[PDB]
Amino acid sequence: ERGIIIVFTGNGKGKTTAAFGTAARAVGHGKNVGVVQFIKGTWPNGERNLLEPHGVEFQVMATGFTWETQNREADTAACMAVWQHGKRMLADPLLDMVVLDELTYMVAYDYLPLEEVISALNARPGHQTVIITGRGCHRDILDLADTVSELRPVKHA
Amino acid sequence: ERGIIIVFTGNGKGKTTAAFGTAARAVGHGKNVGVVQFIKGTWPNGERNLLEPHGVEFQVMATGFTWETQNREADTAACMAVWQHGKRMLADPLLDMVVLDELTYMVAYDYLPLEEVISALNARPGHQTVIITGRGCHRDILDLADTVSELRPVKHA
Numbered sequence: 001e002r003g004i005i006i007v008f009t010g011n012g013k014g015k016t017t018a019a020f021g022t023a024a025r026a027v028g029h030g031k032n033v034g035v036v037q038f039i040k041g042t043w044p045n046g047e048r049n050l051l052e053p054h055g056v057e058f059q060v061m062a063t064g065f066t067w068e069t070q071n072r073e074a075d076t077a078a079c080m081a082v083w084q085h086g087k088r089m090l091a092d093p094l095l096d097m098v099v100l101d102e103l104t105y106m107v108a109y110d111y112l113p114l115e116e117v118i119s120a121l122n123a124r125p126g127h128q129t130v131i132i133t134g135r136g137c138h139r140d141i142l143d144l145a146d147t148v149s150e151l152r153p154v155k156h157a
Numbered sequence: 158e159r160g161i162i163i164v165f166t167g168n169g170k171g172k173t174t175a176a177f178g179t180a181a182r183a184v185g186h187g188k189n190v191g192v193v194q195f196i197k198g199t200w201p202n203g204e205r206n207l208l209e210p211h212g213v214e215f216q217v218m219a220t221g222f223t224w225e226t227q228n229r230e231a232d233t234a235a236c237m238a239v240w241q242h243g244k245r246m247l248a249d250p251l252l253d254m255v256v257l258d259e260l261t262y263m264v265a266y267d268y269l270p271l272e273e274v275i276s277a278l279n280a281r282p283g284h285q286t287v288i289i290t291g292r293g294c295h296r297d298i299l300d301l302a303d304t305v306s307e308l309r310p311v312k313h314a
């Protein structure tokens with residue numbers, strides 16, 4: 001099959017969950033998946049706990065991440081370090097799916113060059129499906145995507 | 158850029174020429190191109206004469222090719238041999254463009270499995286543009302293509 005680019009955006013809950021439900025499906029089907037999480041949570045990683053042991057590679061942003069205006073140099077460096085792994089996955093012919101969780105924020109805060117993103121996506125192995133998640137996804141990424149689902153919060157607990 | 162699939166079909170003259178005019182443009186621009194010609198001509202290869210010395214790989218069907226109903230086994234084997242090279246080009250991340258000249262006939266006469274074609278096209282490096290030429294291109298290849306130009310013979314000398 002031809003790999004496509006899927007985007008889960010919107011303010012409603014379920015973006016990251018949709019992405020990992022997709023990765024789970026793929027894993028359940030014997031496909032190879034790699035994941036990059038651009039935002040580190042203070043909590044234990046259930047998804048990772050589940051998937052990782054199946055051989056799924058996970059790449060998480062370093063704990064140092066500040067978001068502080070004063071620390072942009074250091075933060076951007078960490079962002080770039082993690083992205084290096086992503087670029088690698090986006091170039092691996094053997095990876096059926098790549099999940100780029102909370103990548104929208106990286107672009108929205110300029111910690112990752114858009115151009116670099118469009119390039120790596122455009123140049124990925126043909127059968128490779130990429131899932132991108134995050135609120136406020138950049139319009140140029142949305143245009144490149146094959147499917148864009150916007151999670152509209154009709155209600156939230 | 159994202160590689161696309163271009164198809165030059167129709168009964169009008171200019172299919173092979175359009176494809177090689179495209180390859181020339183690409184070469185003139187420093188891009189890497191590879192070519193497979195599914196039909197061997199009795200004449201000296203001008204395109205090849207021109208391009209080949211620029212490093213362009215050319216793969217031509219063996220001279221043995223018969224089209225004879227009695228020889229399908231041997232013919233299909235030769236077809237498959239040449240296609241092996243094509244599949245390789247369609248998997249090379251460093252090839253910006255791949256030309257599959259007269260490939261339509263290979264599928265139309267069942268010397269090459271359609272499925273194999275759709276697969277290799279679908280799985281090619283993302284920035285890879287493929288040009289397919291030939292009269293009566295299979296509908297399933299036409300559907301996969303991004304641009305399909307049909308050469309309508311309004312007149313022919």
Ligand SMILES: Nc1ncnc2c1ncn2[C@@H]1O[C@H](COP(=O)(O)OP(=O)(O)OP(=O)(O)O)[C@@H](O)[C@H]1O
Nearest residue numbers: 011012013014015016017018133134135151153156
């Ligand atoms: N509208 C909302 N208000 C408050 N918290 C939310 C809202 N939407 C999602 N969350 C939660 O905030 C955290 C960050 O989630 P994010 O903004 O990335 O949403 P999400 O990816 O759609 O959430 P989830 O991981 O549950 O699918 C999550 O724990 C998430 O469950």
Ligand SMILES: Nc1ncnc2c1ncn2[C@@H]1O[C@H](COP(=O)(O)OP(=O)(O)OP(=O)(O)O)[C@@H](O)[C@H]1O
Nearest residue numbers: 168169170171172173174175290291292308310313
């Ligand atoms: N309608 C036609 N009648 C006769 N000869 C034709 C016609 N169209 C093309 N030709 C010639 O027949 C040979 C096979 O060409 P083919 O059917 O593959 O056309 P083509 O690829 O469009 O031609 P060209 O290589 O000139 O671009 C060529 O030498 C070609 O120039």
Ligand SMILES: [Mg+2]
Nearest residue numbers: 015016102133
């Ligand atoms: Mg999320």
Ligand SMILES: [Mg+2]
Nearest residue numbers: 172173259290
């Ligand atoms: Mg021709």
